[model samples]
Target: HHHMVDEILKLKKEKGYIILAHNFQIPELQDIADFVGDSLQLARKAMELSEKKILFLGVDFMAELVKILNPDKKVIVPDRSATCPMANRLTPEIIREYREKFPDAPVVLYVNSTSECKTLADVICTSANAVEVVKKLDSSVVIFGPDRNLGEYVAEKTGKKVITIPENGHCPVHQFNAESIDAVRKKYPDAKVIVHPECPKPVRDKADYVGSTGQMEKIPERDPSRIFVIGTEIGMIHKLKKKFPDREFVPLEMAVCVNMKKNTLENTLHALQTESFEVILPKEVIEKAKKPILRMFELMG
Candidate 1:
């Protein structure tokens, strides 16, 4: 394992590539990365980076996002098969159908969506900015996809009618039962509970705070709780503990995303050595998909 790590570092240096890892990535991968952030953070970071080559350690959609934003740069992934099932569930056809159904409402897609689906979206949003993006839209009703929980959360926050497309689109990883939050409270009475907005309404309601992974990272600064029972993926615990070594971070449940875990050390080393599986997209796809992404930033401004 140490040998692999050394070789990866060596090749990464020789090859002139910067590593960007998602917060949901394993600890080893996160530790080796030049920068670690959530989906939205990584997308913005990829754009401003001086490095021409990127070794993105995340699911396919996220890697494609970096590539879409920096088409001139070389973006490679350890595991091309690492993809979000929830994201895949919402297709371009589904998006088109929804757009037809709600002619007046803008289609707001989550960043977790496929690159192809993004091209069809009116605007792109992350868990961090979903509510804001939806609230800022001119229409009172909006179309959201690929994560019903996040859509519902946005609906509640913005008081907009968020019509979640593709029936029950949701992240399996964030489907923590609300009972787990109750159990954690009993176990650690004073522990503050922080959860991702992608969690079910019941789970979200029971938490002290509901936010994205990016938001979850900053919670410790404002609210100095000695112990935090986090309701998100298991990998997040590593990131939190690393950031604030003085505190304790615990998972509400041992939830894991199998797809995110697909990028192992062996594959990562192989990716650097062989440089296989470079992320490529049609020029048109890059151009079209980028519109909504840029629009997301515009809304924030």
Candidate 2:
């Protein structure tokens, strides 16, 4: 494994491919990545860098996002099949139907959505910014989806009506039982419980804090919690531990995203060596999809 790791690093430097890994990726991939972040953060980081070649390690939608934002840059992924099933569940047709039902509402799609679904969105948002993004909109009711948990969370925070497009849209990994939180509380009495918005409400409600993976990284800095019980994908525990080594990061429950785990060190090396799976979208899709993404940033400012 050491030899493989060294070879990957050597090839990465020689080929001039900047590695961008998502927070949900395995620890090894995260360690090899030049930058680690959520889907939106990775794309935004790519825009900030001068690198023309990107080896994005995540699902298909995220790699597409980087390509869409940096159309001229070359973006490749370790596994082309790596994808969010929840994101795929919501389609452009669903968005159109919802748009008709809620004629005055804006269609806000989560960043986890497919590139095609993004083309129909009025604005794009990540879990970290979903609440604020929806709140900033002029409309009190909005069409949001690909994750019902996140949409419901945003609605609860903003006092708005979130009409989730797909029925029962949710992340399978975040469907943790509320009992896990209760058990963790008993074991780690002093630990601060922080959960992702994608988790079921019962789990989110039980947690001491609810936030995105990006936001969760910052919590220990300000709160000074010694032990933190996290309720998201298990890969995030590695990320939190690395960032705040002094603190204890524990998984509220053992949960994994099968899609995220699809990118392994072997395949990552293959991706860098061959640059086989380039994330290519049509010119029209790039132009159309980019508008909502840009709007999201604008809303933040």
Candidate 3:
């Protein structure tokens, strides 16, 4: 493992490669990444760098965003088969149907959405900034989608009328919560609970705080002292624990996004060697998708 790790680093430096890893990725990948962040954050990170070749170790939609953001650079993923099931649920037609139904509403898409849906969105948002992005929208009623639970959370937080798509875009790891945190709460009675808003409202309701995966990872850095019970994918626990060894970071439940796990060390070696699973978008898709991403950054500002 050490030899492989050293070889990867050597190849990465020799090729002037930058690896951007999503927080949902396995620890081995995250440990080697030049940057680790949410999809939106990684997109922004790629935009800030000057690397000619890069590897994004996340699902396909994320790879899509990185490519969309940096068209000049070569952006490839460890596994092209790696993808979020939720993001794959919608199509341009479905979004067009909603647009016709709510002609006046701005379409707010979760960053988890596919590239085609992103190209169709008026503005894009991740779970971290969904409420922030919605608040800045000029519309009284916003049409948000690809993650209905997240849309519901945004609607509740902002007190605005929200017309959303059905509850189709759900993170497999975060869904199906039967109040699973109770046992963890019992075990670590004093831990501060922070969750991703993509979880069911009930699961988020029990949380002391509900925010994005990046925000959850940043908790201990600001807190003087706080033990955390994380309510997102279990992969995050590895990251938070590594970052704050003195603080207790526990998973509310043990769950995995299978797609995230699909990128393994062996295959990553193969990808670096061959750059096999390149994520390339149509010329029009790049032009269209770039707008919402820029809009998201503007809104974040």
Candidate 4:
């Protein structure tokens, strides 16, 4: 809602807040954010910032990362209840179990995982750096968790023998592929399909391009004439449309994640007003978590 954007802007100024939003956020929410990106990018930004207060508009894991990096700064999640289902799928206990099964395999976690999972990981990877991270690893056998689709995609790219948890943990927004893309493609036959790596194999196989949100943003900049049927989150379409008004940008369908949309204007207002449930974790946990995150940064170079 544009009105929500207006309210958020006012609150941001009044509270001296630095808002960090995820790619899955609604269009207006993204518009109001001081920084917009995925979980890892936002966390990296939080590490660099000297702001007194951080208003996180993503899921629980993202806020936790911000708090982990910048413990002194106040980090508030707009909706404390907005948790990521895929992130919650695997726990430290599960990682310990996996480690027992294959003692030689190193654990590489997707940045979408919970802080507890991060604490257990040897390395952390985003979609943009998944293949690179895997390639940099010294181990021939690697264990990737939480998001099997992402793990499989990275495995395919790096030729690594990836052992993923059989559980079908995935982003619900990326799960509605066949129906969503078919509906859109039937209507717009000539449209170019650009999907995120989070999408299932069938969807990514059919896609004209499969990449991250940042990569998707660059597509219109390079080819404005191409009609894009973006298959990840609906919020990205809003960003794409705003950037390239002359280009046609169509969302694949009702592919929006309800969990990501849970953080409403009212929730943000409450978070700012009460400062209830600010993200905090033990210093030891953050120290342990830093190893995997630092590996990601090194691999990015």
Q: In candidate 4, which residue pairs get closer than 3 Å at backbone N, Cα or C atoms, i.e. clash?
A: none
Among the numbered candidates, top lDDT falls to: 2
lDDT of 2 by residue, 155-199 (tens): 999999999979999999989999988898899889999999999
Question: Sorted by lDDT, highest first, which candidate order results?
Answer: 2, 1, 3, 4
Write model 1 residue lDDT over 54-115, tens digit each, in one string. Answer: 99999999999988888999999988899999999998888888888889999999998999
Pull out the clashing pairs in model 1.
none
Q: What is the C-alpha lDDT of each candidate?
A: 0.91, 0.92, 0.84, 0.82
lDDT tens digits, residue span 199-263, model 3: 89888888888888888877777775568888888788888888888888877778899999998
List residue ranges in candidate 3 displaced over 4 A. Answer: 176-178
Q: Candidate 4 regions off by >4 Å? A: 1-7, 179-186
Return the TM-score for each candidate structure. 0.98, 0.98, 0.95, 0.92
Error of 1 at 101 (Å): 1.8
lDDT of 2 at 95: 93
TM-score of 1: 0.98
Candidate 2's TM-score reads 0.98
Clashes of 1: 0
Per-residue lDDT of model 4, residues 1-301, tens digit only: 4465566677778888898888888876787788888776787798788678999997888888778777788898877788888889898888999899998998999878888889999888887888888998898889998889888898888888899863776777787547667777788888988888888999888788888887888877776556898888888887788778888888776677788899877787677677666887888998999888887788778
